[PDB]
Amino acid sequence: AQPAPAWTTFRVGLFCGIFIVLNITLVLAAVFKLETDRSIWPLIRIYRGGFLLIEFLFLLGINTYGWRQAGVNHVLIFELNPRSNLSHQHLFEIAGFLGILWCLSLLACFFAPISVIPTYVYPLALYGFMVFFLINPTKTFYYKSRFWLLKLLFRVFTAPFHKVGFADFWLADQLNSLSVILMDLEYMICFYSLELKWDESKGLLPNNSEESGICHKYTYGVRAIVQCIPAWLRFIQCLRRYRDTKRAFPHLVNAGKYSTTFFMVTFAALYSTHKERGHSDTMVFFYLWIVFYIISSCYTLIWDLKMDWGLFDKNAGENTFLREEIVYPQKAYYYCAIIEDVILRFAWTIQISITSTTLLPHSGDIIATVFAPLEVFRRFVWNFFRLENEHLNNCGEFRAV
Amino acid sequence: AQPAPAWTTFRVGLFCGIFIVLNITLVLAAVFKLETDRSIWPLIRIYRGGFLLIEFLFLLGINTYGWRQAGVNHVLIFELNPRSNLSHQHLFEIAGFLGILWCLSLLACFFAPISVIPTYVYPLALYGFMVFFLINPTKTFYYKSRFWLLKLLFRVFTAPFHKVGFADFWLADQLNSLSVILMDLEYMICFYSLELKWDESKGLLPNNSEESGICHKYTYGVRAIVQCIPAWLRFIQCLRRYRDTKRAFPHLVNAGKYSTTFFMVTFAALYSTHKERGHSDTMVFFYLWIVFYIISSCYTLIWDLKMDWGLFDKNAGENTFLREEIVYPQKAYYYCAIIEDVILRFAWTIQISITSTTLLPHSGDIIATVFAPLEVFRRFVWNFFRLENEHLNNCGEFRAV
Ligand SMILES: CCCCCCCCCCCCCCCCCC(=O)OC[C@H](COP(=O)(O)OCCN)OC(=O)CCCCCCCCCCCCCCCCC
Ligand SMILES: CCCCCCCCCCCCCCCCCC(=O)OC[C@H](COP(=O)(O)OCCN)OC(=O)CCCCCCCCCCCCCCCCC
Ligand SMILES: CCCCCCCCCCCCCCCCCC(=O)OC[C@H](COP(=O)(O)OCCN)OC(=O)CCCCCCCCCCCCCCCCC
Ligand SMILES: CCCCCCCCCCCCCCCCCC(=O)OC[C@H](COP(=O)(O)OCCN)OC(=O)CCCCCCCCCCCCCCCCC
Ligand SMILES: CCCCCCCCCCCCCCCCCC(=O)OC[C@H](COP(=O)(O)OCCN)OC(=O)CCCCCCCCCCCCCCCCC
Ligand SMILES: CCCCCCCCCCCCCCCCCC(=O)OC[C@H](COP(=O)(O)OCCN)OC(=O)CCCCCCCCCCCCCCCCC
Ligand SMILES: CC(C)CCC[C@@H](C)[C@H]1CC[C@H]2[C@@H]3CC=C4C[C@@H](O)CC[C@]4(C)[C@H]3CC[C@]12C
Ligand SMILES: CC(C)CCC[C@@H](C)[C@H]1CC[C@H]2[C@@H]3CC=C4C[C@@H](O)CC[C@]4(C)[C@H]3CC[C@]12C
Ligand SMILES: CC(C)CCC[C@@H](C)[C@H]1CC[C@H]2[C@@H]3CC=C4C[C@@H](O)CC[C@]4(C)[C@H]3CC[C@]12C
Ligand SMILES: CC(C)CCC[C@@H](C)[C@H]1CC[C@H]2[C@@H]3CC=C4C[C@@H](O)CC[C@]4(C)[C@H]3CC[C@]12C
Numbered sequence: 001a002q003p004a005p006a007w008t009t010f011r012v013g014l015f016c017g018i019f020i021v022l023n024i025t026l027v028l029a030a031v032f033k034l035e036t037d038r039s040i041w042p043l044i045r046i047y048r049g050g051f052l053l054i055e056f057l058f059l060l061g062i063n064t065y066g067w068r069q070a071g072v073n074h075v076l077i078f079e080l081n082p083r084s085n086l087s088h089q090h091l092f093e094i095a096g097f098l099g100i101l102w103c104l105s106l107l108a109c110f111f112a113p114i115s116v117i118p119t120y121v122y123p124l125a126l127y128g129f130m131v132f133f134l135i136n137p138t139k140t141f142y143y144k145s146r147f148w149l150l151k152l153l154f155r156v157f158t159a160p161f162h163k164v165g166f167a168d169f170w171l172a173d174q175l176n177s178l179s180v181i182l183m184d185l186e187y188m189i190c191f192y193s194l195e196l197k198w199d200e201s202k203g204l205l206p207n208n209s210e211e212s213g214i215c216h217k218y219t220y221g222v223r224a225i226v227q228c229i230p231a232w233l234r235f236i237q238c239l240r241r242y243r244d245t246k247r248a249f250p251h252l253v254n255a256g257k258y259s260t261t262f263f264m265v266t267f268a269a270l271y272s273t274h275k276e277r278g279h280s281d282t283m284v285f286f287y288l289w290i291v292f293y294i295i296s297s298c299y300t301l302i303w304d305l306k307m308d309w310g311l312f313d314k315n316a317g318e319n320t321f322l323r324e325e326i327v328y329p330q331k332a333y334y335y336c337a338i339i340e341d342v343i344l345r346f347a348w349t350i351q352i353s354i355t356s357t358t359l360l361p362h363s364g365d366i367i368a369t370v371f372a373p374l375e376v377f378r379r380f381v382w383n384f385f386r387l388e389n390e391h392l393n394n395c396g397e398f399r400a401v
Numbered sequence: 402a403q404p405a406p407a408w409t410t411f412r413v414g415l416f417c418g419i420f421i422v423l424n425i426t427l428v429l430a431a432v433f434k435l436e437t438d439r440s441i442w443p444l445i446r447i448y449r450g451g452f453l454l455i456e457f458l459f460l461l462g463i464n465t466y467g468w469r470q471a472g473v474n475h476v477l478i479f480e481l482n483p484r485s486n487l488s489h490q491h492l493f494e495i496a497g498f499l500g501i502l503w504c505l506s507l508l509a510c511f512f513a514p515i516s517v518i519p520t521y522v523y524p525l526a527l528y529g530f531m532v533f534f535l536i537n538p539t540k541t542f543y544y545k546s547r548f549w550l551l552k553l554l555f556r557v558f559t560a561p562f563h564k565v566g567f568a569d570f571w572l573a574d575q576l577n578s579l580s581v582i583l584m585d586l587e588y589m590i591c592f593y594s595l596e597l598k599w600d601e602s603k604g605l606l607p608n609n610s611e612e613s614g615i616c617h618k619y620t621y622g623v624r625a626i627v628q629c630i631p632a633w634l635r636f637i638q639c640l641r642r643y644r645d646t647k648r649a650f651p652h653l654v655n656a657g658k659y660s661t662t663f664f665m666v667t668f669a670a671l672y673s674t675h676k677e678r679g680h681s682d683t684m685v686f687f688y689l690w691i692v693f694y695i696i697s698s699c700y701t702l703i704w705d706l707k708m709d710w711g712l713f714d715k716n717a718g719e720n721t722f723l724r725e726e727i728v729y730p731q732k733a734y735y736y737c738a739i740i741e742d743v744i745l746r747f748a749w750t751i752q753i754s755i756t757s758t759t760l761l762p763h764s765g766d767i768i769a770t771v772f773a774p775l776e777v778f779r780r781f782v783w784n785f786f787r788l789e790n791e792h793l794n795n796c797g798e799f800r801a802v
């Protein structure tokens with residue numbers, strides 16, 4: 001736990017200050033300099049994924065700080081290099097720099113500094129820069145960390161061909177809580193495929209003001225698939241883990257849990273298409289979707305509250321509705337975590353459903369763009385206690401001990 | 402040389418980022434959203450003193466960093482408490498925060514967020530907040546440092562009543578290089594007394610576009626006195642030190658060096674009024690002012706090069722035109738310091754002259770606003786080398802050794 005250099009602290013402070021001032025400027029520009037004749041929704045949907053990634057990186061930095069200060073040995077659990085581990089300052093710095101890029105791109109999109117440069121390339125430029133940062137072969141910007149992330153992501157995406165370590169499962173679950181990022185990426189690529197109107201200078205902000213685009217409606221069904229990939233990877237990873245251990249509890253339980261949200265997305269897309277054609281069984285399929293929503297959300301909430309966190313232990317004794325031993329300084333943190341998780345499981349499931357072409361009016365987009373940051377926050381608070389429990393008592397039989 | 406807390410470095414980074422983004426926004430606002438029908442010169446003259454104070458604080462933080470790393474024991478020389486001295490991080494922090502305040506005030510002056518609140522009260526708020534932070538009796542914001550600065554300010558301004566320590570001489574010389582700050586403060590008082598037209602909402606920016614105000618002209622002569630006051634303090638401090646030590650070399654020589662500038666500004670202002678009323682002795686008094694220009698500037702340049710820095714030492718040996726022993730890593734730094742002092746020791750006297758209504762065209766204000774930061778930079782370099790020389794060879798007979 002070597003302290004970070006003062007230069008890194010200065011850099012993260014600089015990035016945070018630039019980010020907060022740029023965000024205040026963004027809010028002021030949105031309040032003052034914006035056109036209501038053109039639909040700002042494509043811009044919001046495109047930049048929502050980037051904003052969620054920035055929030056996830058910042059919350060992960062907070063997670064690393066809390067882990068290293070509480071006592072949980074995250075570097076041992078993640079199997080990272082003890083000497084080359086990344087401090088929370090580095091994660092904060094990366095989040096700040098990427099937020100700088102995101103805010104600059106959004107400001108450029110709001111009012112184009114250059115008339116020649118179209119406003120529809122700024123999101124493309126920002127995401128291309130992000131992906132280049134992720135793939136950059138030159139060993140300048142966190143080359144060890146970036147290469148480890150690239151290798152682990154490649155391993156995760158090839159779920160059934162490698163043994164599921166803790167880190168692979170961890171990032172797969174993070175993606176399970178970051179389905180909005182991939183879904184917005186799919187929306188962006190299809191939108192670029194069809195509805196930019198390259199001739200238009202403000203093509204990314206259509207002047208129709210009424211949402212009737214082919215990509216806005218998810219009747220094609222690709223939205224459902226790209227929403228199930230985060231669950232698909234976890235499902236097959238847990239199946240491979242079961243094949244490795246030949247132990248049903250909890251591997252088949254996890255497979256069932258992820259199939260609940262698989263059927264969630266499939267049913268939501270199907271009955272949304274059914275409603276779009278006004279067929280009589282729309283109400284029956286909506287009922288099947290509501291009961292599947294309830295069972296899936298309850299399943300994930302109970303598992304997160306019982307096995308992932310480890311709470312509600314019978315051997316707790318003094319600790320009410322908790323474990324026998326705790327690492328974090330206050331039990332009120334644990335309690336508020338339980339209520340937060342309870343509400344945000346419902347929030348996560350309803351966000352999945354509503355973005356799965358359920359609520360066509362603009363209120364659906366508002367509430368989804370509101371709930372996605374809440375989903376990332378819930379994943380961060382879940383990560384806290386998941387890592388703490390993993391250190392305390394080995395769950396999921398990852399380590400030999 | 403104790404390292405600063407990590408949160409202090411984070412704070413200086415945050416302030417640096419906020420300041421750089423606010424400065425970029427200020428430049429953009431000046432380029433795009435600015436009215437040319439109204440004279441912006443009063444605004445520039447009011448905010449120039451604050452900007453120069455920010456620059457002086459930042460360069461003083463650089464001063465402290467260079468002193469600590471080079472080896473010169475500045476805390477012993479300044480007679481500060483060894484266990485409570487301020488690192489360069491604290492100076493950077495306060496410079497950044499005051500720059501944040503200045504940039505916010507300037508931006509709000511550019512476009513008033515509130516129509517009810519007049520645009521001319523913003524400089525009042527900024528400078529009142531600065532002075533309140535300077536007089537703040539509550540022991541929250543650098544109470545030890547602020548109280549020591551207040552006590553030493555009181556000692557310096559009442560020069561002939563206490564012994565001249567190194568710190569008193571040091572700050573008096575700083576003020577001698579910061580005459581523009583007091584000049585602009587006096588301009589603020591006179592402007593606020595006469596040329597606001599309180600009824601006008603934008604009274605801080607008159608719509609005349611032709612500057613003929615009573616304050617813009619300096620026929621009254623109070624500008625001359627507020628230009629002499631720092632040199633007045635230095636001259637009387639040197640006389641008091643001579644009375645204490647009864648030694649002519651260099652106390653009377655220093656008195657002459659700090660006294661030539663009184664006649665400098667006298668001749669400048671008197672010739673300005675003489676040309677304004679257009680008598681015949683204007684050319685004769687201009688010749689007198691130029692010869693006194695030359696002699697005063699040469700006096701200051703040679704003393705800075707010979708006794709303050711200690712350069713051109715006969716016992717130098719290998720070091721060409723330098724001291725025998727040098728602390729700073731490179732002699733090229735010394736040489737570039739000599740060149741910079743030679744160049745800017747000529748222009749700073751011009752800076753005194755122009756603000757004595759010697760160049761009534763707008764070019765005078767442009768060149769003054771450009772040269773005052775250069776004067777502060779010259780004083781920063783002089784502080785570097787004066788402290789370095791003082792540590793090596795006791796100059797001015799301050800310490801007993
Ligand atoms: C509307 C306008 C926009 C508003 C939102 C603007 C968001 C800006 C970006 C988020 C804020 C980033 C800045 C805060 C995190 C960085 C803090 C930091 O570096 O603190 C230094 C601190 C001291 O170091 P130490 O713990 O001694 O040693 C560390 C060993 N490497 O070391 C540490 O890092 C440890 C202690 C701090 C870490 C825990 C707390 C960090 C987060 C606190 C909340 C920050 C604000 C969150 C956003 C609120 C609004 C949405
Ligand atoms: C170095 C690290 C830190 C960087 C910090 C950068 C901070 C930038 C903050 C910008 C804040 C804007 C402040 C605006 C002040 C008021 C200006 C105003 O009211 O006018 C808007 C101005 C003129 O436009 P308009 O109104 O059409 O003209 C009217 C004619 N009188 O409109 C303008 O053209 C002025 C504003 C232009 C701002 C454009 C910034 C875009 C970002 C630059 C990069 C673009 C590409 C980024 C892609 C990244 C991909 C990796
Ligand atoms: C398409 C869907 C995408 C979904 C999100 C995927 C990425 C999520 C963010 C990264 C995942 C977190 C990684 C683990 C964090 C917690 C553990 C930790 O702190 O690990 C430390 C690790 C240092 O590893 P180290 O010790 O150097 O490796 C062995 C050295 N021989 O260092 C790390 O923490 C590794 C982190 C890598 C560097 C930070 C991330 C770089 C920026 C990513 C940009 C992604 C662009 C996305 C574009 C599409 C957006 C719509
Ligand atoms: C166009 C729009 C306007 C753009 C410009 C706006 C204004 C920009 C403001 C400039 C930035 C202010 C502060 C920058 C330096 C701060 C560095 C810092 O605090 O880093 C901490 C660093 C590490 O600490 P360490 O030396 O290990 O030990 C310290 C012992 N207590 O400790 C140190 O401090 C030591 C290392 C740095 C100290 C020497 C260098 C300081 C100054 C660097 C140049 C700053 C920019 C100058 C102007 C550039 C443009 C002309
Ligand atoms: C705390 C740390 C963080 C600080 C962050 C800094 C925040 C301020 C950053 C300013 C950035 C400006 C960005 C401008 C974006 C584009 C806006 C634009 O083009 O319009 C200007 C807008 C409306 O004005 P106008 O154009 O006349 O209206 C047209 C009607 N449709 O005009 C506006 O009203 C928008 C711009 C308002 C900026 C006002 C800032 C004033 C500062 C607040 C305090 C004021 C008092 C300070 C006193 C200090 C004393 C110590
Ligand atoms: C009207 C004309 C004004 C002209 C300028 C006057 C101010 C000049 C700038 C401050 C002077 C610097 C003082 C010495 C700096 C170099 C030496 C150094 O670093 O000293 C460290 C010293 C530590 O002090 P400490 O240890 O507390 O003292 C012993 C404890 N018994 O701590 C310090 O460095 C003390 C510094 C004090 C705090 C910084 C300054 C506070 C802000 C001042 C605002 C002024 C407002 C002006 C308004 C008018 C503008 C037009
Ligand atoms: C990334 C940091 C430096 C902030 C970005 C600021 C720079 C890159 C931006 C801000 C305002 C921009 C200018 C705004 C307007 C015009 C007019 C036209 O002729 C196109 C270019 C030009 C001249 C832009 C050039 C780039 C510019 C100067
Ligand atoms: C959503 C509802 C309607 C159906 C699915 C929920 C039921 C059947 C399942 C889902 C998760 C399950 C829990 C998962 C893990 C454990 C830990 C084990 O040591 C005791 C049983 C216990 C506590 C299980 C009890 C039954 C359980 C709650
Ligand atoms: C319903 C909601 C708002 C309940 C509150 C949830 C949030 C605010 C709570 C839940 C868990 C909490 C965290 C639990 C553990 C840690 C690590 C510790 O070293 C510092 C506090 C910190 C970082 C807590 C911060 C606040 C926190 C994130
Ligand atoms: C110091 C930091 C927080 C930056 C300052 C930002 C805040 C305080 C400023 C920036 C822009 C400002 C707004 C600009 C314009 C108006 C319109 C009018 O009805 C007066 C108030 C109101 C609504 C202002 C309220 C305060 C405001 C929101």
Ligand SMILES: CC(C)CCC[C@@H](C)[C@H]1CC[C@H]2[C@@H]3CC=C4C[C@@H](O)CC[C@]4(C)[C@H]3CC[C@]12C
Pocket residue numbers: 649650653654655656657658660661664696
């Ligand atoms: C306008 C400019 C030239 C300033 C005029 C005053 C100058 C020339 C005068 C004023 C006081 C004078 C000093 C008074 C006393 C002595 C002591 C003597 O043993 C050596 C010369 C020395 C040190 C003088 C040098 C010249 C001096 C500094």
Ligand SMILES: CC(C)CCC[C@@H](C)[C@H]1CC[C@H]2[C@@H]3CC=C4C[C@@H](O)CC[C@]4(C)[C@H]3CC[C@]12C
Pocket residue numbers: 620621622623625626629630633663666667668670671674
């Ligand atoms: C701070 C003081 C004691 C420094 C010593 C120099 C004094 C005596 C000098 C310096 C500059 C001089 C002023 C320069 C110009 C003018 C304008 C003229 O129309 C009347 C005289 C008057 C007002 C002078 C009075 C005397 C003066 C103030």
Ligand SMILES: CC(C)CCC[C@@H](C)[C@H]1CC[C@H]2[C@@H]3CC=C4C[C@@H](O)CC[C@]4(C)[C@H]3CC[C@]12C
Pocket residue numbers: 654695696699700703704707708
């Ligand atoms: C151009 C004229 C009018 C002003 C400057 C020249 C004359 C008067 C004086 C003013 C201050 C003087 C210097 C003051 C101190 C020293 C150090 C001493 O050990 C050798 C002489 C030396 C280096 C002097 C040389 C001559 C000098 C520069």
Ligand SMILES: CC(C)CCC[C@@H](C)[C@H]1CC[C@H]2[C@@H]3CC=C4C[C@@H](O)CC[C@]4(C)[C@H]3CC[C@]12C
Pocket residue numbers: 467470471729730734737738740741782785
């Ligand atoms: C030719 C002229 C105009 C150039 C201007 C001179 C400037 C750039 C020079 C003069 C003195 C120099 C400083 C002298 C000593 C130090 C201390 C060292 O530890 C870091 C560099 C630092 C802080 C130097 C930075 C550059 C510097 C400020």
Ligand SMILES: CCCCC/C=C/C/C=C\C/C=C/C/C=C/CCCC(=O)O
Pocket residue numbers: 036037038039040044209362366369370373374
């Ligand atoms: C922790 C919670 C995080 C929440 C962050 C919030 C982000 C922004 C929120 C909502 C987006 C705002 C939308 C308002 C715009 C509506 C379009 C109307 C005009 C049109 O239809 O043309």
Ligand SMILES: CCCCC/C=C/C/C=C\C/C=C/C/C=C/CCCC(=O)O
Pocket residue numbers: 437439440441442445610763767770771774775
């Ligand atoms: C280290 C160097 C620092 C330099 C700092 C200087 C920055 C810019 C300088 C001066 C400001 C320029 C203003 C241009 C025009 C002003 C008034 C024109 C309108 C009128 O006449 O009504």
Ligand SMILES: CCCCCCCCCCCCCCCC(=O)O
Pocket residue numbers: 005007008011014421
């Ligand atoms: C956008 C202008 C910023 C101006 C200030 C620059 C701040 C970053 C300086 C980085 C210098 C590189 C040294 C890295 C050393 C290290 O990380 O150990």
Ligand SMILES: CCCCCCCCCCCCCCCC(=O)O
Pocket residue numbers: 406408409412415
């Ligand atoms: C304008 C919003 C800023 C948000 C971030 C706040 C940054 C400063 C937080 C200061 C916390 C207290 C640190 C104390 C450490 C010390 O005593 O040096």
